[PDB]
Design a protein around this ligand. Structure first.
Ligand SMILES: *[C@@H]1O[C@H](CO)[C@@H](O[C@@H]2O[C@H](CO)[C@@H](O[C@@H]3O[C@H](CO)[C@@H](O)[C@H](O[C@H]4O[C@H](CO)[C@@H](O)[C@H](O)[C@@H]4O)[C@@H]3O)[C@H](O)[C@H]2NC(C)=O)[C@H](O)[C@H]1NC(C)=O
Ligand SMILES: *[C@@H]1O[C@H](CO)[C@@H](O[C@@H]2O[C@H](CO)[C@@H](O)[C@H](O)[C@H]2NC(C)=O)[C@H](O)[C@H]1NC(C)=O
Ligand SMILES: *[C@@H]1O[C@H](CO)[C@@H](O)[C@H](O)[C@H]1NC(C)=O
Ligand SMILES: *[C@@H]1O[C@H](CO)[C@@H](O)[C@H](O)[C@H]1NC(C)=O
Ligand SMILES: *[C@@H]1O[C@H](CO)[C@@H](O)[C@H](O)[C@H]1NC(C)=O
Ligand SMILES: *[C@@H]1O[C@H](CO)[C@@H](O)[C@H](O)[C@H]1NC(C)=O
Ligand SMILES: *[C@@H]1O[C@H](CO)[C@@H](O)[C@H](O)[C@H]1NC(C)=O
Ligand SMILES: *[C@@H]1O[C@H](CO)[C@@H](O)[C@H](O)[C@H]1NC(C)=O
Ligand SMILES: *[C@@H]1O[C@H](CO)[C@@H](O)[C@H](O)[C@H]1NC(C)=O
Ligand SMILES: *[C@@H]1O[C@H](CO)[C@@H](O)[C@H](O)[C@H]1NC(C)=O
Ligand SMILES: *[C@@H]1O[C@H](CO)[C@@H](O)[C@H](O)[C@H]1NC(C)=O
Ligand SMILES: *[C@@H]1O[C@H](CO)[C@@H](O)[C@H](O)[C@H]1NC(C)=O
Ligand SMILES: *[C@@H]1O[C@H](CO)[C@@H](O)[C@H](O)[C@H]1NC(C)=O
Ligand SMILES: *[C@@H]1O[C@H](CO)[C@@H](O)[C@H](O)[C@H]1NC(C)=O
Ligand SMILES: *[C@@H]1O[C@H](CO)[C@@H](O)[C@H](O)[C@H]1NC(C)=O
Ligand SMILES: *[C@@H]1O[C@H](CO)[C@@H](O)[C@H](O)[C@H]1NC(C)=O
Ligand SMILES: *[C@@H]1O[C@H](CO)[C@@H](O)[C@H](O)[C@H]1NC(C)=O
Ligand SMILES: *[C@@H]1O[C@H](CO)[C@@H](O)[C@H](O)[C@H]1NC(C)=O
Ligand SMILES: *[C@@H]1O[C@H](CO)[C@@H](O)[C@H](O)[C@H]1NC(C)=O
Ligand SMILES: *[C@@H]1O[C@H](CO)[C@@H](O)[C@H](O)[C@H]1NC(C)=O
Ligand SMILES: *[C@@H]1O[C@H](CO)[C@@H](O)[C@H](O)[C@H]1NC(C)=O
Ligand SMILES: *[C@@H]1O[C@H](CO)[C@@H](O)[C@H](O)[C@H]1NC(C)=O
Ligand SMILES: *[C@@H]1O[C@H](CO)[C@@H](O)[C@H](O)[C@H]1NC(C)=O
Ligand SMILES: *[C@@H]1O[C@H](CO)[C@@H](O)[C@H](O)[C@H]1NC(C)=O
Ligand SMILES: *[C@@H]1O[C@H](CO)[C@@H](O)[C@H](O)[C@H]1NC(C)=O
Ligand SMILES: *[C@@H]1O[C@H](CO)[C@@H](O)[C@H](O)[C@H]1NC(C)=O
Ligand SMILES: *[C@@H]1O[C@H](CO)[C@@H](O)[C@H](O)[C@H]1NC(C)=O
Ligand SMILES: *[C@@H]1O[C@H](CO)[C@@H](O)[C@H](O)[C@H]1NC(C)=O
Ligand SMILES: *[C@@H]1O[C@H](CO)[C@@H](O)[C@H](O)[C@H]1NC(C)=O
Lengths: 120, 434, 123, 120, 120, 48, 48
């Protein structure tokens, strides 16, 4: 399908169209302001992925465990019975908590990597 | 045993307000800073998506309003400013022996004006409509605007014919089109599709009756912000159109004089034949059926045994109490009272119309415009596609209302919503970073 | 519920080549990882090979890494195993089975959920 | 040499100056529009490299085989006797085909990587 | 601490707050020009990190040895007794020399990586 | 007391007080305002 | 100290009649001319 065609599909199926939505993010004063804001938004999202160590991936795994309180559904319900819009609504209140933990994990990983590189 | 996994490119969105781009396939609505349209635009149906729409909180309307006003003012800026016109006029009746409804409507006025050189004056005779001239106390008159604002003469080479305008989302945003048949302006749409640009929307300017718009898919749709609040307007979208045949039958000529270096004033000259009143014809049977359909749809909200009565607009100025429109370049103000003259209990109609040359558009005070006269005889046929009604026991009374131009644009933008794309998200998976 | 039926050859000499296949029905074929397990005529069971649900990832025991190829076709509902060399120690009944791996968004398996009938491979 | 000095050199030699051209890509309304477009173009190229899994490299190898129909020249002719301008002209008609295959390859690789990470 | 809170801290301690300053880099004509310049500056720094092979890291180790002439202090003085402002002042004259060497190192690494990938 | 160059008599001296001093200013007369029109939409206000 | 980099073995095709640098130069020159004349005395009293 095309842009946002997977919006109503399950979380699993919609994970296979990430490049379609990704391409469509970049695709007188008021218009220049709108374009500058679009660029700044895009760059903030790319910076955030970089901070987490996901700078080059569309699907990125990390070392932060799921805390259960955020969502106690099993994988079968989340990936087969829910859409991304429903998931986004369900855990909106915990988004910043997750983001904070992701940043902390990468900082520790960077230090550990440096220390491993220091071994002769 | 689950781990946080980060995804980018997630098909989710949030409600947002942004700046939309102009696209189009001299004209007052022609825009140079407007991109050519895509000959093959795309639409992606979104299965199992039930987006909630609210046409009364749609920020696309405010942008359309500002863009239309801005284009109007840009068009008028590089044109002749008629400051020499606010002079004392000496006027008599154009046709002192006339018994039609045009008796006293056209006055033959004399004034000195200015010339190219500052040392000279000329004597100019011209005809003006009664509605543009105010008596001071041949009789002495002034133009109606002299007491409020200066006049900018519209450039005679710029057409007023509506040009379809397409609004396109910027990257990172998408436009969702309802497509839910019989959608009443609020609530979920189950046929939502994603588009890049809207259809071509013509900036048709009118009051009371909405011309050259879209039609309802199956039945007349009555939309309102609050159907029980009598301070709100009711927008009625018809499923079938009604033709209105409007004319300015007199064969008028146009004269022109110079009023300064490079400046010229165009004015209404002799009438080449009889003076006749402008008017519009609506078939009686078609209107009667259309109005009956509207009544049935009103009964669905007001009661099966409620009496539905239509009446003419009461107070206000000519612009609100008449049907205003641009036909052939002239501004017509049609009575319409013959269309809202009935009580509903469970060959042609001729509407008189007046012509004005000095207008105050967009309900602004302080920016008056003079419309040059159009040479020849004017005839146009328009499609009535919707109505604006207001509401005033056991009997409800409805009147044409109108006058706020954003309501006309709501009748076209009600099916579009602008959303922002939020490509980041997280979800648990059995995937641990090594 | 689930029918897994192996097809294959008979007697092959050392240094030859033999292909087995497994047909399956009664479940969505593309949703499960599959594997091959062999049992020597007088011994117990040992795992031989594993293929993912998508078919892009394959795993083998060291003893067959240079001899066996595992593949699947999800439109034909067919699992195939191509074996080369086939030394005397490879004589066994070869079973196809459903399970043994799960693709991150599914719950863990790490067990063999369904078994076929088994093809007999004699060297 | 300096910026574009290698334009007339062979494809092999010009591959050694990629940082020179790369630096020179970033180096009232009409000028703001030109600068915003330059930024949007740059970001689209970086996004495209990211989609292919080449986000941090100037020279990036992939898993898409050469299809021969695109060009049946051997490596000696391409790298020693042709310039990049000639090569760009020669395969212009196949650029989008190659790009499509590159995207497909990375999507499969990302899924496979995730599945390998899921093994305990 | 918050933004620039570590400015007066030692180089070691301040290395633990890199994400705080990094987030705050992105956070009518004159304002559009200021925003476009901020974006162009950010992108030039990201491009420079990419050229060095550090596109996804806040702390990145390389293969360029310290030349001693640049600074003959031991690690204890630099990381425990100096701030980043003092260090920045101390080696300002050698910044471009270091940058040049970093670029050269990555170019050699990219070629070597390609040659290793070519082995069957 | 702040100055660019305290010994250069061509420069200004800015004195920042630590305490404020109130200044009570008035225009005690009760004046009226008249208005006339001077053009279409133009009006001139003047001291009456 | 502007730079010029000679391109060896490059044969670029030029066409001075389709060069869009000319249209920009024309518009920029006219724009500067008009900007210069804008803040100046408008001699309307002279047409006598
Ligand atoms: C609703 O839509 C209908 C149909 O589109 C529309 O009626 C149309 O109006 C236009 C403009 O008045 C008509 O086209 C004109 O026809 C006359 C025939 O005498 C021509 O002279 C006109 O040309 C003059 O104006 C041009 C302006 O650009 C000049 O360039 C030209 O040189 C002439 O001076 C022009 O071609 C068209 O024929 C009608 N269509 C019908 C079927 O009558 C109606 O006005 C719309 N309603 C509203 C409220 O907008
Ligand atoms: C407006 O009225 C004036 C007269 O008051 C008209 O001018 C006269 O026209 C007749 C011809 O019909 C001439 O014989 C007179 O000499 C004219 N008088 C003057 C003073 O010029 C004028 O034509 C009328 N306007 C229009 C449009 O008919
Ligand atoms: C919409 O729902 C139906 C029923 O679950 C499903 O078969 C269909 O694939 C869904 N649409 C999309 C785009 O996934
Ligand atoms: C889950 O989050 C809560 C805070 O909302 C925290 O108290 C709890 O310890 C977390 N669970 C684990 C296992 O850390
Ligand atoms: C997921 O949770 C629901 C609700 O308790 C349960 O019915 C379902 O069987 C669970 N699935 C798995 C795979 O645990
Ligand atoms: C998020 O907070 C709102 C209150 O602002 C609450 O109504 C909602 O249920 C919360 N959602 C979750 C998932 O905790
Ligand atoms: C025009 O000006 C003259 C004075 O030169 C005056 O006598 C005459 O009445 C003016 N015309 C009108 C129509 O006021
Ligand atoms: C002059 O303008 C005012 C509005 O400012 C209006 O009320 C008044 O009626 C106008 N004069 C005449 C004679 O119409
Ligand atoms: C929604 O779409 C389906 C298929 O396009 C159609 O059958 C259905 O009637 C639509 N619903 C409405 C309310 O138009
Ligand atoms: C009026 O409606 C008829 C029938 O739908 C259509 O053929 C005609 O083109 C319409 N006219 C306008 C101006 O929209
Ligand atoms: C319009 O609606 C009426 C019922 O109100 C129906 O009889 C008529 O056929 C409809 N017309 C169209 C074109 O759908
Ligand atoms: C529009 O439809 C919604 C459906 O929930 C209803 O609540 C609302 O009253 C309707 N409004 C009108 C004017 O029909
Ligand atoms: C509609 O207006 C009435 C009268 O003011 C009010 O009582 C009612 O709550 C309003 N309904 C909505 C949905 O705002
Ligand atoms: C309008 O004119 C057309 C011919 O152009 C005619 O067929 C139609 O009946 C007229 N409408 C009315 C209401 O007179
Ligand atoms: C038509 O007009 C007559 C006028 O008496 C009215 O009674 C009738 O209800 C109207 N509608 C129809 C469909 O006849
Ligand atoms: C009006 O009549 C319709 C039948 O056409 C019926 O469904 C509806 O409930 C009635 N409403 C009232 C208020 O009687
Ligand atoms: C429209 O005509 C009716 C005829 O009775 C008249 O009373 C009304 O005032 C007219 N409206 C206008 C705005 O002239
Ligand atoms: C309303 O209708 C009646 C009956 O035809 C008519 O006498 C009356 O004049 C109409 N009202 C107007 C304002 O035309
Ligand atoms: C108007 O009158 C002039 C002069 O007699 C004539 O040439 C022109 O054709 C007439 N126009 C119409 C529409 O009758
Ligand atoms: C230009 O061509 C000559 C002859 O092949 C070659 O020696 C020279 O190096 C080329 N120029 C460049 C910049 O490579
Ligand atoms: C090369 O491309 C053509 C299409 O142009 C395709 O038919 C052919 O199969 C490709 N070659 C290979 C080996 O896939
Ligand atoms: C490359 O192709 C040309 C043309 O057939 C041939 O002369 C040349 O020897 C080939 N080189 C190699 C290394 O195959
Ligand atoms: C590309 O297509 C054009 C026709 O548009 C053709 O002339 C040219 O030879 C083609 N090039 C290749 C390499 O196929
Ligand atoms: C400032 O210096 C003191 C003394 O060395 C030290 O204890 C303190 O931590 C320093 N401040 C910061 C923010 O590091
Ligand atoms: C250190 O830099 C100088 C140039 O300033 C250079 O001559 C010297 O060789 C460098 N040291 C080493 C070990 O290369
Ligand atoms: C660092 O250098 C200083 C100055 O010579 C010296 O006092 C100090 O002991 C050195 N530290 C180390 C760890 O070598
Ligand atoms: C850098 O150069 C300046 C002269 O421009 C000199 O004063 C300063 O000491 C130099 N710094 C170093 C670290 O060499
Ligand atoms: C301000 O303080 C500095 C401290 O170094 C001193 O040199 C300067 O003369 C002072 N200026 C004034 C105006 O007090
Ligand atoms: C202040 O002004 C005097 C007189 O011009 C000059 O001699 C002195 O150097 C100046 N001081 C500074 C700091 O500029």
């Amino acid at each position: 399908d095309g842009f946002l065609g997977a919006a109503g599909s399950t979380m699993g199926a919609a994970s296979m169209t990430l490049t379609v939505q990704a391409r469509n993010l970049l695709s007188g004063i008021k218009q220049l302001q709108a374009r500058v804001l679009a660029v700044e938004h895009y760059l903030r999202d790319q910076q955030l992925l970089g901070i987490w160590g996901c700078s080059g991936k569309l699907i990125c795994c990390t070392n932060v465990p799921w805390n259960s309180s955020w969502s106690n559904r099993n994988l079968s319900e989340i990936w087969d019975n829910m859409t991304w819009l429903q998931w986004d609504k369900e855990i909106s209140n915990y988004t910043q908590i997750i983001y904070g933990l992701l940043e902390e994990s990468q900082n520790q990983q960077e230090k550990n990597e440096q220390d491993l590189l220091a071994l002769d | 045993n689950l781990w946080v996994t980060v995804y980018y490119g997630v098909p989710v969105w949030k409600d947002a307000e942004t700046t939309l781009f102009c696209a189009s396939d001299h004209n007052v609505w022609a825009t140079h800073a407007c991109v050519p349209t895509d000959p093959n635009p795309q639409e992606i149906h979104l299965e199992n998506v039930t987006e909630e729409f609210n046409m009364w909180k749609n920020n696309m309307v405010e942008q359309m309003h500002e863009d239309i006003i801005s284009l109007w003012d840009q068009s008028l800026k590089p044109c002749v400013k008629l400051t020499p016109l606010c002079v004392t006029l000496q006027c008599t009746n154009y046709a002192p022996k006339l018994r039609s409804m045009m008796r006293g409507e056209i006055k033959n006025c004399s004034f000195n004006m200015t010339t190219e050189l500052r040392d000279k004056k000329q004597k100019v005779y011209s005809l003006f409509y009664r509605l543009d001239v105010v008596q001071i106390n041949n009789k002495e008159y002034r133009l109606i605007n002299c007491n409020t604002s200066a006049i900018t003469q519209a450039c005679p080479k710029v057409s007023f014919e509506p040009i379809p305008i397409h609004y396109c989302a910027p990257a990172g945003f998408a436009i969702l089109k309802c497509k839910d048949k019989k959608f009443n302006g609020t609530g979920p749409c189950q046929n939502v599709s994603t588009v890049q640009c809207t259809h071509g929307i013509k900036p048709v300017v009118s009051t009371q009756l909405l011309l050259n718009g879209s039609l309802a898919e199956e039945e007349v749709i009555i939309r309102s912000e609050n159907i029980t609040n009598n301070a709100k307007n009711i927008l009625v979208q018809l499923n079938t159109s009604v033709q209105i045949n409007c004319t300015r039958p007199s064969n008028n000529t146009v004269k022109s004089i110079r009023i300064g270096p490079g400046q010229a004033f165009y004015y209404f000259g002799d009438v080449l034949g009889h003076v006749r009143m402008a008017h519009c014809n609506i078939s009686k049977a078609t209107w009667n059926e259309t109005l009956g359909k509207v009544v049935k749809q009103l009964r669905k909200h007001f009661g099966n045994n409620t009496i539905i009565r239509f009446a003419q607009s009461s107070g206000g100025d000519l612009e609100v109490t008449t049907h205003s429109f641009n036909c052939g370049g002239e501004f017509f103000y049609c009575n319409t009272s013959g269309l809202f003259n009935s009580t509903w209990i469970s060959d042609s109609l001729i509407l008189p119309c007046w012509i004005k040359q000095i207008i105050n558009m967009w309900q602004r005070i302080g920016q008056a415009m003079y419309a040059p006269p159009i040479q020849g005889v004017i005839r146009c046929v328009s499609n009535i596609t919707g109505l604006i009604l207001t509401r005033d026991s056991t009997t409800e009374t409805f009147r044409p209302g109108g006058g706020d131009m954003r309501d006309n644009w709501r009748s076209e933008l009600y099916k579009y919503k602008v959303v922002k794309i939020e490509p980041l998200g997280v979800a648990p998976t059995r995937c641990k970073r090594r | 519920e689930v029918q897994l039926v192996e097809t294959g050859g008979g007697l092959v000499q050392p240094g030859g080549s033999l292909k087995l296949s497994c047909r399956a029905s009664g479940y969505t074929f593309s949703s499960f990882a599959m594997s091959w397990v062999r049992q020597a005529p007088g011994k117990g069971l040992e795992w031989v090979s594993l293929i993912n649900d998508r078919g892009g990832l394959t795993f083998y025991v060291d003893s067959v890494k240079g001899r066996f190829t595992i593949s699947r076709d999800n439109s034909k509902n067919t699992l195939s195993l191509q074996m080369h060399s086939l030394r005397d120690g490879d004589t066994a009944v070869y079973y196809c089975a459903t399970g043994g791996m799960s693709s991150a968004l599914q719950s863990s398996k790490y067990y063999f959920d369904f078994w076929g009938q088994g093809a007999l491979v004699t060297v």
